[PDB]
Design a protein around this ligand. Structure first.
Ligand code: TYD
Ligand code: MG
Ligand code: MG
Ligand code: MN
Length: 240
């Protein structure tokens, strides 16, 4: 397939169907969809189950269980890294169980990369609906080429050439960073790695959607490193 969509899933029974469905109904149909479930509850598994009937879905379920295992690594990064190793697509993109793809997302992103061989990483604008019907709408723009993606661009707004992954692994030893110190902003940390070698090219269109309302787990992670740290290191890096 031209595109490998890598989605992660953990206990979002009320939302995961809409997420999956938004991918399976894309106008661009030449993709494989990895559903990397991190050993979710019964309710979640049962919502996902019918979608496994779609011949494009490649479902993998971990055996992870308990606070030690959930806090040993940034789980989604480990899952994403696993999927990357199995991916057959020329282009790679990410999805989650709480994010919705707009119908022409894959089509528009694939066209951008097909058309511009010089661009390796692209990103679109993203929209979040704050609920309570809608009380607030937040848009994350995609107006400029950027060498400083961390915390400015979301997990779910990017597509890149597979070849990007080689470079990243060559320097850092892995693709996404599994260190649990980057649990809250794992996307930013992976974008930080990519930004050592590639700028992110914009698609001034809103192509993904989030809905939001306007623990022994938290207490067992290491101190969390933050955005500022990443942005300053890239500014010092001085690639742009
Ligand atoms: C907590 C956890 C999340 N995940 C997945 C669920 C989501 O697809 C992804 C991000 O988690 P999420 O809870 O959405 O974090 P955020 O606070 O950024 O919204 O990680 C796992 O795979 N394993 C886990 O143990
Ligand atoms: Mg061009
Ligand atoms: Mg996030
Ligand atoms: Mn989320």
């Amino acid at each position: 397939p031209k595109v490998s969509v890598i989605m992660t899933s953990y206990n979002k029974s009320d939302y995961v169907a809409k997420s999956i469905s938004s991918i399976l109904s894309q106008t661009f149909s030449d993709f494989e969809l990895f559903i990397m479930d991190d050993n979710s509850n019964e309710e979640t598994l049962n919502v996902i189950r019918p979608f496994l009937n779609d011949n494009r879905v490649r479902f993998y379920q971990s055996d992870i269980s308990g606070v030690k295992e959930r806090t040993e690594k940034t789980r989604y990064a480990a899952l994403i890294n696993q999927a990357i190793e199995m991916a057959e697509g020329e282009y790679i993109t990410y999805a989650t169980d709480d994010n919705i793809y707009m119908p022409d997302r894959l089509l528009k992103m694939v066209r951008e990369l097909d058309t511009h061989p010089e661009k390796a990483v692209i990103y679109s604008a993203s929209k979040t609906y704050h609920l309570n019907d809608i009380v607030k709408e937040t848009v994350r723009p995609a107006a400029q080429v950027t060498w400083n993606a961390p915390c400015a661009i979301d997990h779910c707004s990017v597509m890149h050439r597979y070849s990007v992954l080689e470079k990243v692994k060559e320097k850092f030893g892995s693709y996404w960073d599994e260190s649990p110190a980057f649990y809250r902003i794992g996307d930013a940390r992976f974008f930080w790695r990519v930004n050592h070698f590639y700028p992110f090219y914009p698609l001034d269109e809103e192509l993904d959607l989030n809905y939001i309302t306007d623990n022994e787990f938290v207490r067992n992670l290491p101190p969390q490193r933050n955005c500022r740290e990443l942005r300053e290191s890239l500014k010092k890096l001085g690639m742009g």
